[PDB]
């Protein structure tokens, strides 16, 4: 069980840790989050009481270093930082615990929600999508754009998701225009799985990371990526049985975890109606089809 | 994006553009089987690819053989249209290639787009105009070449005959759309109007009769009357 300490909380802010959130008042004596489950990626996220515009946060893995948060009053945000001096860091952490200045990552023993949303997400893959390779942790916010969005402007601060474009020479084999456009199996299985991702696990990691960035930051661009990666599988007549079984599970926990009140902006009516009712896998997503119908029947 | 009355003069400027109409690509007669079920028998079709400035018609004849053992034929018709237009573009020298292709029906937007991915400097545009190009098969000599074709075949026409010698493209196109709109609303009446005077003939190298400017005015008047009559009938008004 690992800990992400805070030097201080100088500004009033709502702190997210994964799917949990805590209000902290301006100059309340708050000094971090303890008992963070080892083994998974985590995100710690922020929305200032005074500007609900700009949600931002940090993907990290406690196995990769000792990380802490410090408020920078120049740049105006909670900053994640690495403490290389390990003995200084244990000394800091042990104090704040003894003084009980730390909220405890509030995991119900039965609750597998985080594992289920981050099952294929690995810090090494997050760091290739979010390039700032002098940190072991990745910064994301609401407004960061995607490589693909820039095509259609600051490269350093882009989300470098795998470009998916159904009307591209990548997607369409010369001489198989109709076959490849109506059945995207060659785009999914040869170009993307064999070609670019290597395996189903890295495909699902990127899909899951895009969803979480959509949900936690309302990143419009991650939303488009999450939907594109779903459509490409649903619009492929030929998908390994295990990918379909795993997709239904991934989508189930993502739909289950979505705030009820955000299904107007985070869910794309057209993509889901196609996936559940029209596409080749219309009958392959029982769990996702059931929760979508019982929780969001309006959208469909 | 789309093409309407607001940007209508665009059609007669000096960017090479083509209209594509796929409404006669896949044509069926519906009949009863011996068992008293229903079956279709396909007949020869055509892609109606037209340059509205010059009147050059690229008439790609679709022989019924292209449908043999194919499923979802009305969806295939769209993709076969896209494929043939792509091929025509690729057979044209660079300075003859169009900068735009306007599809008369929206269901052609994606098929043409996907077939034209190698030509990203060619805009694929829908139109909000309801253009009577379906009536192209009411033109005797186009109907003839399509029904006689024993194989895939591309036949080049000028659908304006020699009109451009005397009138603008704008005016030629209007005359054309008026003749086709008439033919589509009442083929019999329309064609009676065109041939009732035996002294005005169709030149062998032409599609329409050799009318004087005066006789065109009269014909054009008769086609406008026929289009209102039929509309008055359709709508009891």
Swiss-Prot record, chain A:
Q: Where are the Phosphothreonine modifications?
A: 257
Please tell me whether the keyword Cytoplasm is annotated for this protein. yes
Question: Where mainly located?
Answer: cytoplasm
Changing residue 236 to A has the effect of:
No effect on interaction with PRP8
Annotated GO CC locations: cytoplasm; U5 snRNP
Q: Which residues carry this modification: Phosphoserine?
A: 236
As for family, the record states:
Belongs to the AAR2 family.
Q: Which purpose does this protein serve, as stated in its record?
A: Component of the U5 snRNP complex that is required for spliceosome assembly and for pre-mRNA splicing. Involved in splicing pre-mRNA of the A1 cistron and other genes that are important for cell growth.
Other noteworthy facts: Present with 7330 molecules/cell in log phase SD medium.
Q: How does it assemble?
A: Heterodimer. Interacts with PRP8 (via RNase H homology domain and MPN domain), competing with BRR2 for the same binding site. Component of a U5 snRNP complex that contains at least the U5 snRNA, PRP8, SNU114, AAR2, SMB1, SMD1, SMD2, SMD3, SME1, SMX2 and SMX3, but is not a component of the U4/U6-U5 tri-snRNP complex.
What is the protein name for this chain? A1 cistron-splicing factor AAR2
Curated annotation (Swiss-Prot), chain B:
What function does the entry list? Functions as a scaffold that mediates the ordered assembly of spliceosomal proteins and snRNAs. Required for association of BRR2 with the spliceosomal U5 snRNP, and the subsequent assembly of the U4/U6-U5 tri-snRNP complex. Functions as a scaffold that positions spliceosomal U2, U5 and U6 snRNAs at splice sites on pre-mRNA substrates, so that splicing can occur. Interacts with both the 5' and the 3' splice site, as well as the branch region. Has a role in branch site-3' splice site selection. Associates with the branch site-3' splice 3'-exon region. Also has a role in cell cycle.
Q: What is known of its domains?
A: The MPN (JAB/Mov34) domain has structural similarity with deubiquitinating enzymes, but lacks the residues that would bind the catalytic metal ion. Contains a region with structural similarity to reverse transcriptase, presenting the classical thumb, fingers and palm architecture, but lacks enzyme activity, since the essential metal-binding residues are not conserved.
Q: What is this protein called?
A: Pre-mRNA-splicing factor 8
Q: What is the effect of changing residue 22 to A?
A: Reduced growth at 30 degrees Celsius. Strongly reduced growth at 16 degrees Celsius. Strongly reduced growth at 35 degrees Celsius
Give any extra note attached to this record.
Present with 468 molecules/cell in log phase SD medium.
Tell me the subunit arrangement.
Answer: Component of the U4/U6-U5 tri-snRNP complex composed of the U4, U6 and U5 snRNAs and at least PRP3, PRP4, PRP6, PRP8, PRP18, PRP31, PRP38, SNU13, SNU23, SNU66, SNU114, SPP381, SMB1, SMD1, SMD2, SMD3, SMX2, SMX3, LSM2, LSM3, LSM4, LSM5, LSM6, LSM7, LSM8, BRR2 and DIB1.
Q: Where in the cell is it found?
A: Nucleus
Q: Impact of altering residue 21 to N?
A: Reduced growth at 30 degrees Celsius. Strongly reduced growth at 16 degrees Celsius
Region described as RNase H homology domain: spans on this chain: 7-237
